[PDB]
Each structure stands twice: as C-alpha cells, then as structure tokens.
Structure 1
Amino acid sequence: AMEDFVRQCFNPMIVELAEKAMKEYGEDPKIETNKFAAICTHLEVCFMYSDFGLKHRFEIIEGRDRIMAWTVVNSICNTTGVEKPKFLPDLYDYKENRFIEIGVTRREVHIYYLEKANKIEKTHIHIFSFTGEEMATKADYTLDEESRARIKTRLFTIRQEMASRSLWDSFRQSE
C-alpha cells in the first residue's frame, strides 16, 4: 500500500506530523494515501531546505501548529519590518530577508509556479519537481547548488521508490 511506503521511507517525526495534520482536519491517511505521501514529501523538503544553513539562516514554519506558526511570523515581521503574508509560508530567509513558499509538484514546474504565484504577495517562490527540475522567482534559487542537489536527489529517490512499488502512476496523477 502507499501508506506502508510512507511509514517505510520517512523518519517518524514527519509521519507523526503528516498524520496529525490530516486527522485533525478530518482526513484519513489510510484512505487519502497519495495525500499522506505528498504531505510527508513537502515537509521533508521544507526541513531539508531549512537545515542547509550566518549559522542559523532559515526559520522553519511548516511543521508548526497554527498558534506557533503565526507567532513566529508575527515575531519576524515585528523585528525585521517585512510585510505579513495572507497565507502561512514554509520558510523565512534571515540572509536574503524575505519569506519562502516551497512547492513540490509531479507536474511541470512552471505550471505549479503559476498556481502558487496566483494564490499569494511578496513571498519568494521555489518549486521542485521529482524530475530534478526547479523554478524560483527571478530565478533566485536561494541555495548553493550543493544543497539544491540533495533535495532533487531525495525527491527523485522518493519518485523512484514509489515506482519500485508500482505506486508512481497513482501518485503522479493525483495533483
């Protein structure tokens, strides 16, 4: 099952978190399996992205409960002066001094980019695909190629792990 794969291929903290997020909003990961597996993959991106960095470069926001998330956001704005987003972003960058929205899609990167841009308003956008493809505002990719390589590989690995289990097609088509 997809769900097996999720518990089998992701550190529990992440699976724990994905399960909390879904089940609090009345979604079953035993049913919404491809969503379970998508939420995990996003989180891991976000965590990875955060921890590739001025020792402490980024502020993780995705992962946190909504009290904490908006606390950290309200804290950041109140001291840096950067405008408050209408929707919770995944990261803030204390170096480039702006929020980031991390997208991960199984479709093309320019499509998911437009979707993202469309919804937001001054947040940096970065999209990763599972094909080692990415696209980011002003093509400002924000990270030393070194780091961006590691995500791309992980995502590709997750793609390819799904395909070992004949799970890719299901997943690819559920976005």
Structure 2
Amino acid sequence: MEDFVRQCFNPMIVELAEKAMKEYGEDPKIETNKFAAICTHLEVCFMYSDGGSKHRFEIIEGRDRIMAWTVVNSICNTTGVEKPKFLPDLYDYKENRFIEIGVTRREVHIYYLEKANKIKSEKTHIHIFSFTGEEMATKADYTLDEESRARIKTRLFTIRQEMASRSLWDSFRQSERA
C-alpha cells in the first residue's frame, strides 16, 4: 500500500500527503490507507481545477495554511463573498462560490450530510465523489461539464481497480470513519 501510493501518485502529491500526516503526528508508513486517501483527494482537487476554462478556479487545497487563508481572505475582500469557517478546496470565479470537494470510500449521500453539517455555510458548494461512479453536489449543480466529471470518476475507478489488483481495496474501502 505504501508502494502503491508511491507508485500511482505523483511526487508532489505524495510529499503533501506526508507533510499533512506528520503534522498530526501520524506515520504514512503505518496509516497507509489514510495516506492513500489524502493523495486521492488531492489528485481529485487538481483534476477538478483543470476542468474549467483557463482561469476558472483558484486552488486552495494543497497550500500551506497562511497562503490558503491569504487566498481565501483576499477573495472574500475582493468579492463580498462571506468568510468560510474551514478552508475550502477551490474558489469558482465563474459561479463566485467556494467549493468543498469530498472523496468517499463509503456512500456519497452520507458523506455529503456529514460534510454539510461540519461546514457551516449556506454558501460553500459541496461536491462528493466515490470510487464507483457516484456524485452528489449541492442543489444538483455539478459545476463542471459531464466530460470533466467523467475523467474524475474514471480515474477514481481506475485507482480502485488498481488497489483491488494488489489486494489493497477491501482494507482501503473499510478505513473511512463517520
């Protein structure tokens, strides 16, 4: 599983995931499903940012804390958009809203509710993906076109397939908590 992540995710994603884990005092070499999840979520974040036109999204996920809030506060100032309680993952310049992107090994509707309840926002859009084709976005507005979405859902499927080929999937599938 450690080998699978090192192999299937690019080196910048793997370094970010390491740093995030070590900041909570966890060891990527032992909490390898968490490691994998983090990498997976980051890749989805970047993929999604690339689904727009050229300048459509601002990436927030993947940045250190000071920079991430610098971006967020700067947007809130230059747009009147209200200030989220938690860092989001993206800002959408076209829809003028922050996005929270979830990637779940469970079911999309449950993770959506959990995410909605943790956020406190009538205003941050939430978009959840699974490894088996499901999405659930706020007010059924999936933001990107179906082809962008499909490239994301397919990549997640491919990840799941690759894990299962290495017998990592059962364990990975069962590692996410409420």
CA–CA separation in structure 2 for the residues paired with 1:24 and 1:129: 26
Q: Which digits, 9 at most, give the CA deviation of each residue in 1:119-150, with x for residues without a partner?
A: 11421000000001101010000001110000
User: In the aligned structure 2, how far is the partner of 1:110 from the partner of 1:86?
Assistant: 22
Rounded to whole Å, the distance in 2 between the matches of 1:109 and 1:24 is 28
Equivalent residue, structure 2, for 1:42? 41
The 10-residue stretch of structure 1 (90-99 or 50-59) with the greater mean CA deviation from structure 2: 50-59
Q: Cα 1:54–1:157, aligned 2, differ >3 Å: closer, same or farther?
A: closer
Q: Which moved more, 1:30-39 or 1:14-23?
A: 14-23
Cα displacement (A) at 1:55? 2.3
Number of the residue aligned with 1:60: 59
- Residue 54 of structure 1 and its aligned partner are, at CA, apart by 5.3
Q: Distance in 1 between matches of 2:41 and 2:53?
A: 25
Percent of residue pairs identical: 99
Q: Aligned with 2:167: secondary structure?
A: coil
C-alpha spacing 1:54/1:132, structure 2 compared with 1 (3 Å): closer
Moved more, 137-146 or 116-125: 116-125
Question: Cα RMSD between the aligned structures?
Answer: 0.8
Summarize deviations over 1:6-49 as a string: whole Å, max 9, x none: 00100101001111111122110001100000000000000110
Residue 137 of structure 2 corresponds to: 136
51-60 or 125-134, larger mean C-alpha shift? 51-60
- 1:74 maps to which residue? 73
Q: Secondary structure at the match of 2:35?
A: helix
Q: Distance in 2 between matches of 1:61 and 1:13?
A: 15
Would the alpha carbon gap of residues 38 and 75 (structure 1) be closer, same or farther in structure 2, given more than 3 Å must change? same
Q: Which runs of 5+ in 1 are unaligned?
A: none
What is the DSSP-based 3-state SS (H/G/I as helix, E as strand, rest coil) of the residue aligned with 2:55? coil
CA distance in structure 2 between the partners assigned to 1:25 and 1:72 by the alignment? 23
Offset of residue 51 of structure 1: 1.4
C-alpha distance in structure 1 between counterparts of 2:23 and 2:88, whole Å: 20
Tell me what 1:103 maps to: 102
State the alpha-carbon separation in 2 of the partners of residues 53 and 140 from structure 1: 15
2:15 and 2:30 map into 1 onto residues whose CA distance is: 16
Give ranges in structure 2 of 5+ residues lacking alignment: none
Distance 2:110 2:53 in 1: 34
C-alpha distance 54-37 of structure 1, shift in aligned 2 (>3 A) = closer
Q: What is the TM-score with the length of structure 2 in the denominator?
A: 0.96
